[PDB]
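Notebook p. 47: complex prediction with S-adenosyl-L-homocysteine.
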Amino acid sequence: ESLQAEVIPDPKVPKGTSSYQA
Amino acid sequence: NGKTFNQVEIKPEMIGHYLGEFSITYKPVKHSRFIPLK
Amino acid sequence: RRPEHGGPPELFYDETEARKYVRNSRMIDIQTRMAGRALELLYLPENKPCYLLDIGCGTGLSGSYLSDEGHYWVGLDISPAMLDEAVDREIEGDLLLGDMGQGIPFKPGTFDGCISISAVQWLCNANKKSENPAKRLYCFFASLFSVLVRGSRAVLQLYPENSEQLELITTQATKAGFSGGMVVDYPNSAKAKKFYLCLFSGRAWVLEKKERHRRQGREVRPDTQYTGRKRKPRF
RNA sequence: AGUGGAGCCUGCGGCUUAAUUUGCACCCGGCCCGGACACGGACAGGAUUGACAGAUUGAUAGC
Ligand SMILES: Nc1ncnc2c1ncn2[C@@H]1O[C@H](CSCC[C@H](N)C(=O)O)[C@@H](O)[C@H]1O
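Predicted complex, structure tokens below:
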């Protein structure tokens, strides 16, 4: 008899240095 | 320096130069052969 | 304008030319990176010891590069002055004096690889009446196919002065059984264009109808975007 | 006589760049302005205009 199994049964830089000149 | 501001402390050793020497306006430039199989 | 037009290689390559060759920085630099390209152009496996031929060795700086990579080699040349300054250079490998077009005196199944630097272009022209470049090239290439291991590789660097030299060299190579091709390094360049012969041993329907009616000399509708265009489905 | 070798300069490519303009044009920051028509909102209880002083600003400025 088939069962109702719809879903799967298996579950160094300074302070002011800018980023440019760094 | 053209895009950003560089913040610098004026030291006594800095006594002769221009300010523009201490914010550089350009960035440093940081810059496979066929073998025959038949 | 070119060394080939000087004459036979035993006369253009005298002692004075040898001493100008050995004291020449551009010769050293270019022929060194040509030896590098020559050794990298045959797919001999890495970490595998191999035995090589270095023909047209002249100074042996190509041999010095081969010995730098750990590999051993046999030098063959026609000019005595070149072999004299090569032994004066204290090169590691063994040299031999002999014409390549007459034939290489080695037993078959011997060398894992062959490297020829600026030498095959000298066999394209005849500087003696007994000389014939076609048969000389055939003999030299058959001697390569003999003395090489079947399945080994041979790189053959050249600067062909025209396509006739390439035509004859390739014909004499392909009639000696050699399979391979041409690596033309930097093809469209000029100062780096270097030839390396590498070898080894094994709606339209309506358009047609309207062009028909145009050729036949009658009035035809102008050809537009709507020439062949399905007006509607047909039920 | 050379050039191709070397040093330097320059031209195309390519690479780095915010930009390295192109077959002052480029970049980074700051100003200035910028429809009527229709319909719906606010508007004399107030629409909106002008402004000294100080400040932000790289600087000044009722912009
Ligand atoms: N038919 C021939 N047989 C043998 N050697 C030949 C030859 N024709 C030319 N050669 C050799 O080809 C050489 C050209 S000079 C090559 C020098 C070498 N590539 C180096 O720089 O290390 C000369 O030494 C000349 O003797």
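Notes: DSSP finds no helices and no strands in chain B. The interface with chain C takes residues 33-37 of chain B (CB under 8 Å).
Next step: compare against the earlier run before touching the bench.
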